[model samples]
Target chain A: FLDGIDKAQEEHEKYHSNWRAMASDFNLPPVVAKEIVASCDKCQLKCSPGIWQLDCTHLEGKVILVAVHVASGYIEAEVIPAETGQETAYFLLKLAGRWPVKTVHTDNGSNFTSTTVKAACDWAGIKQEDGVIESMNKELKKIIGQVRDQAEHLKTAVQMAVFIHNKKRKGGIGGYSAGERIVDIIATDIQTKE
Target chain B: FLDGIDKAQEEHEKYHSNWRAMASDFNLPPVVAKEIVASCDKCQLKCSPGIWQLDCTHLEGKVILVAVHVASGYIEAEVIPAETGQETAYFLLKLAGRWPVKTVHTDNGSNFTSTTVKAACDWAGIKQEDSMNKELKKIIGQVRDQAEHLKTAVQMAVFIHNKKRKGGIGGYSAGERIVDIIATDIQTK
Candidate 1:
């Protein structure tokens, strides 16, 4: 995990070597490949931000985990040392005050299904929804499309590429920007949605 | 949207041109460029149905959207009309069976929130759960990435790939194909 930047740069170089070789075959000028290679790392990184999806590197350990509330796409997150059942219960109780968070779509993990998490939900009168995080993980993979064993650039690249993802609304479901959706859910009058 | 295969192929060719040119600059070698270039179209399509996510091609109109049991991950998608609230009721009834579905997680679509859907759940004697389906969609994308474009090509080439999607063994969780591509989540679950 700690292969560091040099190893990552080496991997990037290897990726470029591969790119140029393929382009020459199709009669493409070398520069096109160069530009693509030059920008590829940042591009891949800019596309995905995993579950704790955040743009703040300084928040490596301090970032709050959040989900964009589905009803209004609000960025609702809770600060948790680790994503545990106890933390989730506290998170839910805080959110449920505004509206019943009936289902919480999230990754399939023990913490989410823990007795405490379930109890918290039971107490709060909300149902627990899980599994979408795994899917989001998958979507992020498809967007990044490459795996450099020693690289750290992937995440940064994705953050930088945020603009491109924003520029194009994807697929259907009338794709909304992750940021917009998160903020929307947060800004909505929770009382009204209920 | 229907650019067809020829145009897509042409676009692929051009894109590969850019990819190949870059490979040469780093003196990486032709094979690697080909591999990266190979990861286009079919790769994206493999990651998801159609070329785009949530585009409705794979969804079509008639989908028997069954909630996969969370614990076992066993799926039971029922074919239904393209109407809105049907699934909410249909799934609750299915839950009343031997399975005893504990909860349901769904997107924030109004249909899922409708009075009919909520009423049916209330009658079902079980907890109803709802949330955005972003995670599910993302995993579906991951499944495509794992098999590269192989999954998509098979779907394209096979007559009933969709029918057989969750067919074998414990059936296919989105994680099986998808997690392999994304490193972080892959290790977690």
Candidate 2:
């Protein structure tokens, strides 16, 4: 791609000048050009799961659902305000126990990215692998706004959905619930003769 | 006595450059020599906190203690069954919630070693290591001794000791606990 070599200079005199002249043909602001280079260096993704549609309206005046695991699909949520840092993490830890917590997915809501949530996730051993639970969020939102308006029913509905999702796990350990599946997994190992 | 090897052969092996001589004398196999060396090299030591000793003269069964840590040295202990492993670990997790858990220390009581307790720790991703609850065990034994001697103040002694040990700061603040333990011990950069 060398062109218009600078025959006057010494070290990269000829070839370097060619690059400079060639660049002149491209009209781009310095900042914009820097940004283009920097953008290439930047990563398109960060570690951590996408998000979960945790329906926390059940707690009502007390707290809000902050997180969910769209994969394990068990929603360990919290009831906290739209706060950003430690206060929120402390609340989630109350529900989610301690940190170095497995993987947690939450909606792209500001609360999930807030200091509180991130700190708690950091503490609980949660990995920041990206994933998708947006469909769950959109569906929950639609259902909440249209079909199920009452807080109590929404809670029950979510619970039912969780229950059905667990009970009907497809791999066919004879259609066992997650809990039952776990129990079975353990039981088979220890049942011995009987 | 030395498999008819006599003192000469034994002394040569132990004190002289006698490897070739010993081989000529005994025709010992490598496996046999290895077994002899291994027998001499073995050192066995088993370390474990012994069983729980509780005051039981006046009572019928085990009086378990569910030690709840309410932050710092402030622990809240609830008397419970030795079989309540799941419950014990659960309350332990509750107490440890406000603090960063590095290790969970418990007595090698049957309760702490039970599968339920172990599973709880597995779920929390923490190792449940145990040791002897010597002081508590001693105090309980003393109380039982007093009860065996027909003393009525046994119950009163347990009450006083328990009241003082429950629920207080373990010499650290919640923020301090987090900063010192949980915040630094993370899975990321």
Candidate 3:
């Protein structure tokens, strides 16, 4: 189907994951073009036994938790008021609930490995891996100064970056795009079944 | 202007081909800054203030020679029958005659630059220099739309960029400034 995750995403992100551009350029079904963009990884992040990398960075004097789905290079991050254990624990369950993962990597700051977060991870059944360097630098840079201000504009840009990153597609050689890997994983499952 | 070359150039490359971003971020007059970006250094072909870098990759099964003005943000791009110094001299002098250029900047790349380009620049009084890639990709990619017509895409990007506004000439577009330069030369003659 033209609606498959692979084809739809290639056209979708071609112009910054613009829904209208995909429809206009490829002559894809308006409804279906909108469909794969949401459904292919909808109601939640794609489920996989992947490494979820976490880190923090600053913008407009605010701290943001930058999360990356290592397997697919998909990102779904957020801005937290503080880097407290409670905040970490709070965001952990929040993302884990919406998107399942086995292990998460974060910088080993006290706030990152605190008791509250440890307990949260215990319940979520995720192991804590240590973070070393980037993901925030490369992915987050795409939106930093690329979008506007604090509060409303900041929130808009953060999620907008998430949407943009999730939409971008690469390859198996380049490591499948955040969205592409999800679809490829499904293709793998379907193949095993046969 | 706090929106001077320093800040503007940094912001320009960060978001090359995006005039509005630079205009708003620095609070520079959108009209003035818009022109600066349309003809800045980083986006233009690798060269000097008036530098024009011409090189080739492949498309439509032929090579396209891309050119840019490091200072004005205007462009003069096309496809030459070949990339030889003799061929290079033909286009180089052609533009120099039509457009008053100060320097002809580029690496002394062979096939054209080894001798012919050096001698041409010397006689033409075009002080040659070495070269940057932020703007060209965006412009080239914009018009590519699966069409193999690289030269046309280059032309369109050039046409659109020059029309975009700048600071150097009291709020004139690159196209407008080019006319003034020509008229001034005629007056001297």
Candidate 4:
């Protein structure tokens, strides 16, 4: 059993988290294939994230900012006055109060590149990196669209997005909810946030 | 107050799901503005999703077929052996089994245009309309880049992505919204 499972795990690495492809290709049983990939260390580390991706979008008239810890999938959001550097920087400071923000990779927008944001990053010992956020932006924009017409609860909508994202959201990354991860990380109960 | 609420509701129609615009334009109070829009019948069904979209991609050595219900944002994917029309038709049949497949929109790939796929669609009541999957394609590519094996990563990508609580379409995830709009029973095949 050890030898067979060990051989399968090595071949499973080639498929990474794709047990479907590996299972089909390797002709392994469905249950064993999924279990192998699900427990693969290489797949686990690659999917698990430690970086926080921040993005801001304008909905109706509200400038909303959202931060997501990529690996764990935990999220934080704010409905600010504008997508300005000061506003984003201020939001970053508040986020620092919530967790140990080591790295913040965001929309290389002027809002994230300003002196105010730089100071906040530097002050908090955060490694600010520029790269990407297509899926994140699309998701955030979709949230803005939901509240696009509602002036009263636009902020609350962003909050609710955060709530749902952290609590019930799941898929390609982790089977456990982002809220469950928050509990694993610091015991920060999601119900408290709601 | 009825006039105020009546005017606000009428104004909100222009924005559809965009209540923020209506609230700002009318200068109405938050609670009242929300109540008016939340109860809006127009805004509720404004995000209809009878249309299911399809797209296929080649990664590493795998030809992957992806299907998404546009309005509900529900997604279904299968990693097929090839991108041939016959293979695509088979996937469509499998998908139709999963849900009431209406209009299936895909790009003009040979895989979708073949007589095999067309006949399958024509036989069923499903409408064949080619549309788009620019983001879904990119997302598969993104997922491929993340894993050691492209196939493993692609499966994980679609699964995790489906679980996400999407922002725009009423804060429902792809699977969640699918259940919201359609009569879903467990697909046994």
**How large is the interface RMSD of each prediction?**
21.6, 38.8, 18.2, 10.6
Which is the leading candidate under lDDT?
4
Alpha-carbon shift of residue A40 in model 2 (angstroms): 49
lDDT of 1 by residue, A1-194 (tens): 13333333444333322223323333344334334445654222101111221111113344244453444322443346666677766776776776445556555567667898788878877655533433443433433343222236554433323322332222212234455444434444453357
Measured against the true two-chain complex, the DockQ scores of the candidates, in the order shown, are 0.01, 0.00, 0.05, 0.05
Cα deviation at B20, candidate 3, in Å, is 4.1
What candidate 2 gets wrong by more than 4 Å, as runs, is: A1-67, A77-80, A83-88, A98-100, A106-108, A129-132, A138-173, A178-194, B1-189
Looking at candidate 4 chain A, the ten consecutive residues that score lowest on lDDT are: A41-50
Error of 2 at B179 (Å): 64
Clashes of each: 42, 27, 6, 20
TM-score per candidate, chains pooled: 0.25, 0.25, 0.41, 0.41
Please give the range of 10 consecutive residues that has the lowest summed lDDT in model 2 chain A: A11-20
* Model 1: residues with Cα > 4 Å off, grouped in runs: A1-79, A94-100, A105-108, A129-131, A139-194, B1-189
Task: State the local distance difference test value for candidate 2.
Answer: 0.39
Q: Tell me the lDDT of model 4 at B18.
A: 42
* Candidate 4 local lDDT, residue B158: 66
lDDT of each: 0.40, 0.39, 0.59, 0.64
